[PDB]
Design an enzyme around this catalytic site. Sequence first.
Site, PDB file in Angstrom:
ATOM      1  N   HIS A  43     108.669  -2.752  83.582  1.00  0.00           N
ATOM      2  CA  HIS A  43     109.475  -1.548  84.211  1.00  0.00           C
ATOM      3  C   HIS A  43     109.259  -0.169  84.522  1.00  0.00           C
ATOM      4  CE1 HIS A  43     108.561  -0.734  79.690  1.00  0.00           C
ATOM      5  NE2 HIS A  43     108.729   1.153  80.220  1.00  0.00           N
ATOM      6  N   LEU A  44     109.743   0.269  85.143  1.00  0.00           N
ATOM      7  CA  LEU A  44     109.194   2.008  85.050  1.00  0.00           C
ATOM      8  C   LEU A  44     110.643   2.902  84.674  1.00  0.00           C
ATOM      9  CD1 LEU A  44     109.119  -0.108  88.420  1.00  0.00           C
ATOM     10  CD2 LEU A  44     107.884   2.601  88.344  1.00  0.00           C
ATOM     11  N   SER A  45     109.997   3.748  83.154  1.00  0.00           N
ATOM     12  CA  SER A  45     110.687   4.629  82.365  1.00  0.00           C
ATOM     13  C   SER A  45     111.519   5.488  83.270  1.00  0.00           C
ATOM     14  CB  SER A  45     110.304   4.698  81.347  1.00  0.00           C
ATOM     15  OG  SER A  45     109.955   3.916  80.790  1.00  0.00           O
ATOM     16  N   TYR A 125     111.022  13.296  80.785  1.00  0.00           N
ATOM     17  CA  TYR A 125     109.635  14.410  80.341  1.00  0.00           C
ATOM     18  C   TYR A 125     108.962  15.286  81.294  1.00  0.00           C
ATOM     19  CZ  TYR A 125     108.207   9.634  77.899  1.00  0.00           C
ATOM     20  OH  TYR A 125     108.585   8.643  76.731  1.00  0.00           O
ATOM     21  N   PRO A 128     106.940  14.518  84.967  1.00  0.00           N
ATOM     22  CA  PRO A 128     106.824  13.471  85.091  1.00  0.00           C
ATOM     23  C   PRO A 128     106.432  12.665  86.300  1.00  0.00           C
ATOM     24  CG  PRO A 128     108.591  13.639  85.843  1.00  0.00           C
ATOM     25  CD  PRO A 128     108.093  14.754  85.998  1.00  0.00           C
ATOM     26  N   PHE A 130     105.647   9.130  87.179  1.00  0.00           N
ATOM     27  CA  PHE A 130     106.766   6.830  87.467  1.00  0.00           C
ATOM     28  C   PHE A 130     105.747   5.634  87.689  1.00  0.00           C
ATOM     29  CE2 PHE A 130     109.516  10.741  89.002  1.00  0.00           C
ATOM     30  CZ  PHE A 130     110.647   9.939  87.911  1.00  0.00           C
ATOM     31  N   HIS A 131     105.266   5.217  86.418  1.00  0.00           N
ATOM     32  CA  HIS A 131     105.030   3.915  86.646  1.00  0.00           C
ATOM     33  C   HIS A 131     105.001   2.981  86.045  1.00  0.00           C
ATOM     34  CE1 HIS A 131     103.569   5.588  82.612  1.00  0.00           C
ATOM     35  NE2 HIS A 131     103.530   4.661  82.384  1.00  0.00           N
TER      36      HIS A 131
END
EC number: 4.6.1.-
Length: 185
Positions: A43-45, A125, A128, A130-131
């Site tokens: 997933h990517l938060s 955050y 941020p 993304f990862h």
Amino acid sequence: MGNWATHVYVPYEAKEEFLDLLDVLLPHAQTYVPRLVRMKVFHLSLSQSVVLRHHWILPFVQALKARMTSFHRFFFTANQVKIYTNQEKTRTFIGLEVTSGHAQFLDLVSEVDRVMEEFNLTTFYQDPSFHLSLAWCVGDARLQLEGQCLQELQAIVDGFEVLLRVHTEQVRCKSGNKFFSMPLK
Ligand SMILES: O=c1ccn([C@@H]2O[C@H](COP(=O)(O)O)[C@@H](O)[C@H]2O)c(=O)[nH]1
Ligand SMILES: [Cl-]
């Protein structure tokens, strides 16, 4: 009744081609840090993991649905290997950082953040990154993974769509053991 762990993210489809790439990449990382464990789901938060009172789970989900279903799908690239920790440096992750499409992720986060504020929850955050997390371990293994290992992981990736052009299709919210899905436009 309780207060439930709640997290909003973009799910990432674990196709065979992607899992086969992990079959090459992760054992290489495990030569440096054997105790790395492969993620099961990907997933990517879009939010922090927050705590939400039970009676607000369904209304929170419906608010997210309203916003997401007018948000247009987009492509992103996630082919840059990165090492990072959780806030307290008690876990280390190997992930794929989003390059192209980052700005579209920021626009999705803007919308998720508005729902967070509506429910009196923490917004995303500052600054941020993304990862897509691929594997994790306990402790701070940054010293072992950065440097030679990371360069070799990057070389494996560079040597391989799947990662270049990923299409966002859905947003999902996990709350406790509940999983709520919604399509993008
Ligand atoms: O912009 C970000 C994104 C992630 N994380 C940290 O990386 C961990 C793993 O991220 P995720 O891949 O579960 O989103 C998070 O729980 C959080 O501690 C940040 O600090 N800032
Ligand atoms: Cl180890």
